[PDB]
Structures are given as structure tokens and as C-alpha cells.
């Protein structure tokens, strides 16, 4: 005689503590604990009294000899709004968060703080355990084929099913609606769900989605080899210091030149390139001027602090252009020029763009994500098939000798026990969302224009393919590009927003987001205390109404570009 949504019902969910039936028979509950309410903190909204359940699914040994399991953590509030929530991952996953239901966007509130039931997974591997010194550290899960499948799609499927079964037993009813919010790798997960598991979630937010993540290391090898002629000095292995190709002052000059060409193309000079399409048609660093001195951005002779050398201009132009093979066939996409490639807040230069292709300037070693960091490591072990484990010191050189006629094929290939390609299990490129749309599914995409991890133009290209394949796609899927914003957060733009509130309104009331309110997390980039702007559904952009404070969303409306 155990009442629903109670401490007794919570503790009954543990193995050997009752009658709970899990969808996957290999589910092990390690924790089923009643949690008191937690007060608000400086960085988190208050958490209601809830049941916390944590465990793992399909504990096994991989073909690499390492243990694998799909961890989950679920929190079911005693006072429940009838909604189910899953948060996405980041990086290459491998960690189990507090699972309070992050909504991204730099937000204080969690889904659990709004009385959702919330769940998270580690994706099928554990960074504390699946750490192989001969397979590039925590990307070493790529040595096991099933761990790849779990990372690609299976972990989120198993955890969604397990969460909904516990919700049904704990509350005595299924969730009215289910929601998923993820950014980066979590954005790829959201797109994967809409394509592969259309009925798992009714509302999906997919920010900066790496829906072509196996191509990232291809872009990384390209940007690495493109910036190398501008590098100064060598690291300990004799590899050119890609981080020395551009100083922070150099990048700020590039950004200021982008603003000189593109800032006013939306009708208002405000440090924000709202008209990104017009900017791409207008800006060329080989021709653009330095608006501070009126002279050309590219140096005429020797390098000064007010110009970029012709080698630098050639290098960044090639990097932004995107990778091509010998036939000239594009292998990923190009990248948009934007002011968030740099930015200055007080005396602090923005690192949020250069960390991906360049790395920190004040280092005698390469530390860019795409040169020697996690992204380059992940491609070699997780996305190349068969995997290419190596010592950590060899990664930068491996990117320098990357062959664009041979190596890109490895993301489409199968080998031995690796029976799916990395584009098979990790890719989420399908525009067949009819099952998702026709059951009432709604999807909000967002992407920062100054994202150096994944190209915002590549998300836009996906959205255009979606609208062509599905007439009237704006009725269930809308894309919100964020000028100036880096990867998932940061940069001179309005990078903070509450995506959960309009997602619920769209799914449950049919109210499509004609704009989404946003604010800047670092308004010092513009020298103000605060800046609020509307995000606009693609292809619309923000247009100043002609009067009022330029830092207040009320004085802007969404419209077609000028
Ligand atoms: Ca502007």
C-alpha cells in the first residue's frame, strides 16, 4: 500500500526493493533516494523535494578490455507538472551531470526547478574509467564498436525508455509531454531524436548542433594546414605553432574590419552584424579597410599593429573557405565572417572563437581543439574507421599530414567489428521529419554566428534543405541564428535566452515563436550594463525600429533583411 510520488514509492524503485519493471532487463538501480528541497544559489534556481534514481544499463566488457555501461540519473519531483525532460550532452560525453535538467542559454533555472521530471546520461562510457593512455585519453571509447553505437544513438534511446518507465510507476501515469534540450553534442542528439526516434520527445531544442560531427576533424585538419604558413615558431615536436599565427590584437583588428564592412548593413551601427548574408557577400579581408586608420586591413609592407600580413590574410581566408579534396569537392562547409571572432570586454580579449582553430597565443605549445586537442583526438579514435589510436604528442603532426583524398573516406567506412560508419551512428543529416511533425513535434534550432566548432551556415544549409523537403516547415521547426555568439555561449552578442518557455508554448498551445527574447551575458563587449535583443526565425533578422535605446529589445522587430 505505497502511495504514489512518495518517499516509499521512490525507495521501492531500487533493485530488490519492490516490483519495478525496466524496459531493458539489464538495468541496475544503484541509488533510489528521497532528496529534500534545495534552496536557490547564486547560479542555480531552487530544487523541489524529489526522488533521485541513478544506475546503469547493459554493463559489459568491451573488445578493448575496458568496462562499459550506460549510466543514467533521474530526478522526479514530489510535486510534478506532468512533463518529462532530458538534457543533452557535450564534448564526447562520458560524464553524468547532476541531472537537474539544464536548459542551456546561460540560464539560472533548471527544468527540475520548474517541476519537470529530469534525466541525463553519460552516453555509454565513463571518463573516469574509459581513459586509455594509448588511445588518446577519454576519447578511448571509440575502440569499442558498441560504445560507438551507444554514443551515437543507443544510450539516449535506452535512457529515455528507462526514464519514462520510472515516471509511469512513480506517478501512476505517463508524462503529458516530453522535452529535450541540448547544445553542441547535445544539439546533435536532439536532431538525432527528431530523425531516428520521432516519438521520444514532443519538443526539442537543438543548439549549435554537431549534426555532421565526424566532419569536424576534417575541417580541423584543413584549418590547421591553412594556418600553418602564418605560424611563428615550432612546438616541442617540431610542429608549427598554430596559436602564434594570430595575436589577440590581430584577431581584434579582423573583427573591427568586419564591423566596418558589415555592422551598418542591418541599418544600425551597434557592434552586431545582424545582416549576416549581406556581410558574407561584402567582406573580403584582402580588400577590406581598417576603419580606424582608413588604410587597407592587409599590410602593404612590414607588419604593424594596424594591419595583417598577406600571409595571415591568405591563411584565414583559406581556413574560412572550408575543406575540399583534390577534385575540389567541398567536404564540410564554409564559415561566416563575424565580429564574434574577437571582442574586447574591459581589457579581456575574447578567446571563445580562437580556442578552436588557433589556441591560446601565450603558449609555447599547440593547444587548439582542432590541432592537438579533444576535437582532433576524437576524430582519430571515435570517427575514423578503423580507429587510429596514437600517443598524444603525435596528434598535431597527424593533422599536418592529413590527406584530404584518403582520410575523409574513413568516416564513411566500416572495418571488421566496426560494422557502422561514424556517419551512420553519429550523423544526424536526415530531413525526413514527417513522423516528428505529424505527431505534434516542434523543434527550435539555434546557432551562434561566431561558432568555430560547427559552422552556423551549415545549420542554415540543413534548415534550407529541410524546408525544401517539407513545405511549410516553419510550422514545426524554426532556426534562430545569434550574431556575435561563439560556441553555445559567449561572445559579443545576445547569448542568453530561455528556450524552454517558448518550446512549451509551441508544443502545448501551438504558438510558434515569431521571436525569442535574448540578452548578452557579457554586455561589456558593447560597453553597456545590459543589452536585450530579439532572436529572429530564419531567414529574418533584427531591425531597429528607428527610435529608443539600442540596448532594449522593445525597439527591435524581426524582418526580412534590407
Ligand atoms: Ca548592426
Author numbering: 42 to 603
What did the original publication write about this model?
PETase cleaves BHET to MHET and EG, and the soluble MHET product is further hydrolyzed by MHETase to produce TPA and EG. Overall, the structure of MHETase is most similar to that of FAEs. The structural conservation between the hydrolase domains of MHETase and PETase is striking, and despite the large insertion of ∼240 residues representing the lid domain, residues Ser225, Asp492, and His528 effectively reconstitute the catalytic triad.
